[PDB]
Design a protein around this ligand. Structure first.
Ligand SMILES: Nc1ncnc2c1ncn2[C@@H]1O[C@H](CSCC[C@H](N)C(=O)O)[C@@H](O)[C@H]1O
Ligand SMILES: Nc1ncnc2c1ncn2[C@@H]1O[C@H](CSCC[C@H](N)C(=O)O)[C@@H](O)[C@H]1O
Ligand SMILES: [Zn+2]
Ligand SMILES: [Zn+2]
Ligand SMILES: [Zn+2]
Lengths: 417, 281
């Protein structure tokens, strides 16, 4: 109401659109809107952190990209776009009745996609990916090669031992690989694929500082806590402080136990992963506890999956843009087997059945999902585990080439094959 | 008795193969492993799980028909002459150890006669001396009258071949066919696995030395009685690992497929002299 009245003074050439917060109409303009012309208040910036990369079960965004609220949104018809625009924002910044006019357009393109750049009072700056990139963005020296040693890796909430597989693919010599896990299927996977070399512990809630000390020094501590109780798109979520969210704190403890003391300058590195859909207070508390700001890395650059994840850690050069390698499969069609056709160009895991086979809507294959996530083929085919269990295992797992990108400079710090 | 002379190497051509009750396309995989050029590989099968296996593993090359009872002599003729016909009809309506069995002429036992028909239709006529070969498989444990009736129909006595000598599995099977020198004793190759323990993954121990498929859970894992793994069972039966991991089929379905599937090195042994009869890669 008040915001709508203000926008009146904006179009009467009495107020600059760049001087008003186009999300909620607050006067406390501090930052500029990264996607379009206008200002942004701090409160809306926090809302913008949570809501932009939230997707519903249909594979489209949960909320409007502009105001990061809205009660009824317009979905986008154009290929590979997942954005939504709430009716209210469209009926202000573009013009009155433009929203219902977009409702009636059966082949409709949203304003983020359409070829033209000017749309009424709404203007889109062309540098929005780079500004968005920067918006979401004790140093050890290099060790000389002869002094390099095999890496020792602790992987908490190890899952299917993706980290050891990545280090093997990079040809780094692994002295030992200790892994905490509770799911029998996931325990089996590591044993088989890595030939018994993986020391399986059990419940991470049994792991003491004494255990960590007597297991010998660790060179790399890695992990991803369960995201079911952190991800905001779960209505029944218990947050960071209840249910399975609190396993992150156990990770924080064992990382603290595994970190060298001050004055001991031996090389040590860590990587923690979580979903982008994590709450403002949850994300803030995690970011404060790990004493760093997260780097946001999207799988779509190197892994042909729309999987935007936060990575806390101290791996060197982890800000540098992702450079694809020829080995990597940037296309979903370059991962499916012959006779199957990809609906979309990227799979969505944070149409429901993204396969066209024999003019029929088929579901995603487990092995094709393996190839998408960058795992060497038939990695999770070890025991007599259900399709549901293998799907859940691949879903919770890391994107392999993203982990290869992050782990890549560790080759300059430990012994290589 | 019609025995074909050896074809000289320059005249050799790619093999044309009809595989009825093809299952998971074991025959094409063995011919490839033996390095015989395959012009075509037509396969009849009806279960989706098995259908997917061949498609993925052999890159669409396999011409799928479907129901064997939909395959006519006209179809066989327009699909061009075949050089090798292979197959194994359903075996647990023949096995005496299933009380509800229907024998050879009832239920699924009678499915062999379709194979017998299409084999006859695919066979060259008398006076046409072009090379042609066939191989049919079944379980040893069938009825004596059953075995006799099959022996009468296929105009040969079965060879009994046990898998365990070359495949570390108790799978004693009858093999009808007219492959040259198919009576010769089984030879072992270093590539082949003769010990169940060798097939098992690290941390697991084999109770027995040979599995029994024609203690019920023959695995020692972590001082516990575990069941057979499908990937270890594949390594037992001589298949390349992860052969059947193609679609969204249950572990029960994969077990059923590997149970009904051929022992690979036994079929490889029988297929071995075909290298002296067709073109090489
Ligand atoms: N209390 C607990 N103790 C040890 N592991 C647990 C646990 N609760 C959940 N987990 C395991 O931790 C995993 C976190 S999902 C992360 C999987 C892993 N990062 C990968 O790449 O595969 C889950 O698979 C779950 O099986
Ligand atoms: N009526 C029918 N028409 C076509 N195929 C059939 C059929 N009835 C059964 N089959 C298939 O024939 C197979 C016989 S079991 C033999 C499988 C194959 N010889 C192998 O070694 O893998 C079964 O897997 C079954 O799927
Ligand atoms: Zn605001
Ligand atoms: Zn909006
Ligand atoms: Zn769009």
């Amino acid at each position: 109401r008040t915001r709508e009245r203000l926008v009146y003074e904006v179009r009467q050439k009495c107020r600059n659109i760049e001087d008003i917060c186009i999300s909620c109409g607050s006067l406390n303009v501090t930052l500029e809107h990264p996607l379009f012309v206008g200002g942004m208040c701090q409160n809306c910036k926090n809302c913008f952190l949570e809501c932009a990369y939230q997707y519903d079960d249909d594979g489209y965004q949960s909320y409007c990209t502009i105001c990061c609220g809205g009660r009824e949104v317009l979905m986008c018809g154009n290929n590979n776009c997942c954005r939504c625009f709430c009716v209210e924002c469209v009926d202000l910044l573009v013009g009155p009745g433009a929203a219902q006019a977009a409702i009636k357009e059966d082949p409709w393109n949203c304003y983020m996609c359409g070829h033209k750049g000017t749309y009424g009072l709404l203007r889109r700056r062309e540098d929005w990916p780079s500004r968005l990139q920067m918006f979401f963005a004790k140093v050890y020296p290099p060790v000389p090669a002869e002094k390099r040693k095999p890496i020792r890796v602790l992987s908490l909430f190890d899952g299917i031992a993706t980290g050891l597989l990545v280090l093997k693919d990079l040809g780094i010599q692994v002295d030992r690989y200790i892994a905490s896990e509770v799911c029998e299927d996931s325990i089996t996977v590591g044993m088989v694929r890595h030939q018994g070399k993986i020391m399986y512990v059990g419940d991470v809630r049994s792991v003491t500082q004494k255990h960590i000390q007597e297991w010998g020094p660790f060179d790399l501590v890695i992990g991803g806590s369960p995201c079911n109780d952190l991800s905001i798109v779960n209505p029944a979520r218990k947050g960071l402080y209840e249910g399975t969210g609190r396993l992150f704190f156990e990770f924080y403890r064992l990382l603290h136990d595994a970190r060298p003391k001050e004055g001991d300058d031996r090389p040590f590195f860590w990587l923690f992963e979580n979903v982008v859909a994590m709450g403002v207070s949850d994300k803030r508390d995690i970011s404060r506890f790990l004493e760093s700001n997260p780097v946001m890395i999207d799988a779509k650059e190197v892994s042909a999956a729309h999987r935007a994840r936060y990575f806390w850690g101290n791996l060197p050069g982890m800000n540098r843009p992702l450079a694809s390698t020829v080995n990597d499969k940037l296309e979903l069609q370059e991962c499916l087997e012959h006779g199957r056709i990809a609906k979309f160009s990227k799979v969505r895991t944070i149409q429901h059945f993204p396969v066209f086979m024999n003019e029929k809507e088929d579901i995603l294959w487990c092995t094709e999902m393996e190839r998408v996530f960058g795992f060497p083929v038939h990695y999770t085919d070890v025991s007599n585990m259900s399709r549901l269990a293998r799907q859940r295992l691949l879903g919770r797992s890391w994107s392999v080439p993203v982990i290869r990108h992050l782990f890549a400079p560790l080759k300059e710090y430990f012994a290589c094959v």
